[PDB]
Amino acid sequence: GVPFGLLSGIFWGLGLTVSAYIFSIFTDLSPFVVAATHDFLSIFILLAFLLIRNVSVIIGALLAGPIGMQANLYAVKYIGSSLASSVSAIYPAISVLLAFFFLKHKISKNTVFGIVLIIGGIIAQTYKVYIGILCALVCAIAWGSESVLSSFAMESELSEIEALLIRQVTSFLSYLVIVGQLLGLMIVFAAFDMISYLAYYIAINRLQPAKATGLNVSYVVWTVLFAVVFLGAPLDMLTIMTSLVVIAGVYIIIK
Numbered sequence: 001g002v003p004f005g006l007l008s009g010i011f012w013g014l015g016l017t018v019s020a021y022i023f024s025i026f027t028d029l030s031p032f033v034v035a036a037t038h039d040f041l042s043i044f045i046l047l048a049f050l051l052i053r054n055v056s057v058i059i060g061a062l063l064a065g066p067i068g069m070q071a072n073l074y075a076v077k078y079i080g081s082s083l084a085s086s087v088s089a090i091y092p093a094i095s096v097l098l099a100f101f102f103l104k105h106k107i108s109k110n111t112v113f114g115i116v117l118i119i120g121g122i123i124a125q126t127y128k129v130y131i132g133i134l135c136a137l138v139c140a141i142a143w144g145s146e147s148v149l150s151s152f153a154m155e156s157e158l159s160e161i162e163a164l165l166i167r168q169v170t171s172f173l174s175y176l177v178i179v180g181q182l183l184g185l186m187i188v189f190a191a192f193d194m195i196s197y198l199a200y201y202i203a204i205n206r207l208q209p210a211k212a213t214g215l216n217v218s219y220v221v222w223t224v225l226f227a228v229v230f231l232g233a234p235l236d237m238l239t240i241m242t243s244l245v246v247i248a249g250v251y252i253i254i255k
């Protein structure tokens with residue numbers, strides 16, 4: 001069960017760097033259409049896996065799709081290959097802050113304490129860098145509410161056919177109301193995002209969000225590994241330290 005969330009970290013961490021690889025080749029020539037086609041291509045490779053409490057899903061999906069994911073997409077233009085991932089990784093603190101007050105109290109002396117060290121090893125480097133940090137704070141508020149609102153239903157509603165299916169078509173319908181090689185990189189980015197968000201939901205089913213979201217912020221270390229090997233990040237001395245505090249806290253939350 002625990003690996004399912006650890007798999008959610010690496011796969012979104014590699015995918016959120018190939019999205020930076022997409023923008024790095026034209027420098028945000030198209031801000032918004034990337035996210036609209038993102039869910040458009042996502043529905044088809046999500047349905048490729050094939051071969052009412054719906055309100056609680058849609059009210060958290062519009063709280064993290066129209067304002068959470070695409071803000072991580074367009075509102076994070078070039079501030080960093082992972083510099084948005086760091087401060088958007090305080091979202092478990094916003095999620096645990098909401099989860100503890102909505103009939104979910106299962107934390108220990110070294111379960112949220114590992115989340116605390118994971119945030120303090122990031123906030124210290126947060127200012128080692130306006131619009132980018134704004135939405136990166138917004139992505140933290142949005143995904144943290146979605147994690148509890150996704151865990152809200154989570155009964156007679158499977159992680160795929162109701163959890164991630166309604167979550168995808170809701171944001172895809174939202175952009176419909178708000179409105180070659182790139183399609184290969186887009187469908188490649190869609191292929192990595194959809195195994196990730198399902199694996200995050202499979203970790204949300206059996207494992208509590210306080211630990212499932214806490215193992216997810218491993219997506220901050222893999223998003224620097226992919227961003228320094230596939231992309232050649234400068235990796236100053238402060239990067240290895242923040243990479244260590246976020247994994248040193250991962251081994252406190254996992255145990």
Ligand SMILES: C[N+](C)(C)CCO
Nearest residue numbers: 008012143197200216
């Ligand atoms: C994929 N998100 C990072 C948006 C959710 C955590 O898995």
